[PDB]
Every structure is written in C-alpha cells, then in structure tokens.
C-alpha cells in the first residue's frame, strides 16, 4: 500500500534520495519480478504498491541501520528474487554484489534482471549455500554478508557466517521468538560472530513487526562450518 511518493520520501527522510534512474531501475524491478513470476515461483506478491512496500522498501531498511557507503562487497544468501541486495545496490551502486541461490531458474532471472537494469559489479552463482561456503575463493571475503530468510537463526548462521571477512557484518533481516534467538546465539557465538544489535520497528502503513540483525564477524569460522548440503537444516547447530 505503497504509493511511489511514500517510497520516495519515506527513504528520504532515512537519508536515501532516489535520482530519476534509480526510480526508474524500480520500475523495470517490478515489471520484470511479476512477468517472470508467471514462469517460475518468484514472489508470493505481486501488486505493485504491495511490492515497493514488502520488497523494495523492506530490502533498504537494512541501510537504515548500516552504512552500505563504508563497504564495498557484499553476498546474499537470498531467495532468488534479489532481495534485499539487488534494492541496496540500486540505492548503493558502488557496492560489488554476489548472490548465492540453489535454483538456476533463479539465478537466470537474476542475470536477465541484472542486464535489464544495467547493473555493473554483479555475480551471480548457481550453488547450494553450503557449498558456496566451503569454496576457497570466497570463503570469508565479503563486507557484509546478508539475508532476508525465514530460516531459523541457527541454520541461517551457519549459511553465512562463513562468508563474512573478519570484522565484516552478517545482517539478517526477519520479522520476529526468545527461544530461537536464544538457539541463534549460541551458533554465532560457535561460528565466529558477536551479535552486535538487534533493531525492532514496524513496516510503514502495514505495520507488521520487523527484526534486523547486525553480527559483527569477531573471530574466523571453524573449518567444518558449514556442514554438507542439508546437514545444518538437519541437525542446526543449536
């Protein structure tokens, strides 16, 4: 429920001002996620002001609480529709993107996505997470790795924790409880990170809660982290 002013001057007033080309690589976003999803299961959402809101503006809170003009590389561990880092890189286009997705048909629309939009410094990688992960050439060499996931905070830590560089940030954005945070802890703590801070705020106009996670990456990951394609879904860390 959306409209483009309300995305325009809600980012503003954040600090993010949108010139005519970012506003337009919006638009060709939005024409380009609904038509694909009639081929593939993209989006559970598909009318426009319900998208700028639950997709486009939900991906840039995270730049409310980071400062994306401080980094230079991020990964997303996404669900193949670029969310949240195809919106950040819009927004921020200096930053070198790489998402991660397990289905080609995704990674497809992403390439076709990228072009559409005329992104510079994107790569995208057919790959399971887990995989990803254990790969010597980006093992740990990401600013700031993020993830826009229901998965449960274990499992998704042991995702991405292993991407982050030292010091780097793990952001994860999710919509909510105590126990599984608790869980969630714990396998930061294991993989290397330090929880850093938790933001609590409401979606504009829905008002449905949201939760963002910094994870500062204070120590390197152990080596067997993560474990083999399905084994942290299987068996979480914690």
């Known amino acids: 429920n959306m409209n483009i002013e309300e995305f325009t001057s809600g980012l503003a007033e954040k600090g993010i001002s949108l010139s005519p080309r970012q506003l337009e690589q919006f638009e060709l976003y939005y024409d380009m996620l609904v038509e694909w999803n009639e081929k593939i299961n993209l989006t559970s959402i598909t009318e426009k002001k319900e998208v700028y809101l639950k997709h486009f503006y939900d991906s840039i809170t995270a730049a409310?609480?980071?400062?994306?003009?401080?980094?230079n590389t991020i990964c997303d561990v996404g669900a193949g529709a670029g969310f949240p880092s195809l919106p950040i890189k819009i927004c921020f286009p200096h930053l070198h993107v790489t998402?991660?997705?397990?289905?080609?048909?995704?990674?497809?629309?992403?390439?076709?996505?990228?072009?559409?939009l005329q992104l510079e410094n994107t790569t995208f990688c057919h790959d399971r997470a887990e995989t990803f992960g254990q790969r010597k050439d980006v093992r740990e060499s990401y600013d700031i790795?993020?993830?826009?996931?229901?998965?449960?905070?274990?499992?998704?830590?042991?995702?991405?924790?292993?991407?982050?560089?030292?010091?780097?940030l793990f952001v994860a954005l999710k919509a909510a409880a105590?126990?599984?945070?608790?869980?969630?802890?714990?396998?930061?703590?294991t993989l290397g990170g330090e929880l850093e801070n938790i933001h609590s705020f409401k979606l504009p106009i829905e008002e449905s809660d949201r939760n963002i996670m910094v994870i500062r990456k204070i120590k390197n990951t152990p080596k067997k982290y993560p474990?083999?394609?399905?084994?942290?879904?299987?068996?979480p860390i914690e």
Do not use: H, M, W
Request: charge should be positive; glycine fraction near 4%.
């Open 145 to 168: 790795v993020t993830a826009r996931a229901v998965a449960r905070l274990s499992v998704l830590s042991e995702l991405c924790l292993p991407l982050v560089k030292k010091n780097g």
């Open 178 to 189: 105590e126990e599984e945070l608790n869980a969630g802890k714990k396998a930061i703590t």
């Open 227 to 235: 474990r083999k394609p399905g084994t942290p879904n299987k068996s």
């Open 99 to 116: 998402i991660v997705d397990s289905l080609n048909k995704r990674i497809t629309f992403l390439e076709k996505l990228s072009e559409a």
């Open 64 to 71: 409310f609480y980071v400062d994306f003009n401080q980094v």
